[PDB]
Amino acid sequence: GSHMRMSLIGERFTEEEQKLLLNILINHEYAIELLSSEINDIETGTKNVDGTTYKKLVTLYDRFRFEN
Amino acid sequence: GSHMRMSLIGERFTEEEQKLLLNILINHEYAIELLSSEINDIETGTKNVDGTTYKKLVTLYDRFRFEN
């Protein structure tokens, strides 16, 4: 199965992990670079949407703190 | 001088950096583990205080994305 990254899907769950998978398989870990950029783009960058962005920021930890 | 850690001060600027400093000096980086734990403590833990928790979340990126 090809390691084609999907940046932030909103679950990224085992069969959809290829994101976190590619990022751990390469030279340095990378999903958190997105996570911190993303949380601050909502907090102080003032991005605004329905549960889409909520789900990206909360799924980041839902894999990073637990699965990874 | 000493490396003795301060976990989350809410600034951790170059002179107060001994936190981020100790965390990069040991086996692997660790301030980032706090970042994902912290952001989810706001997002789903529903922390609320008079800029203290705001400052912890926004300071994490203010050194992670930029400095370290």
Swiss-Prot record, chains A, B:
Signal peptide: none annotated. InterPro entries: Antirep_AbbA. It comes from the Bacteria. This is Uncharacterized protein YkzF. It comes from Bacillus subtilis (strain 168).
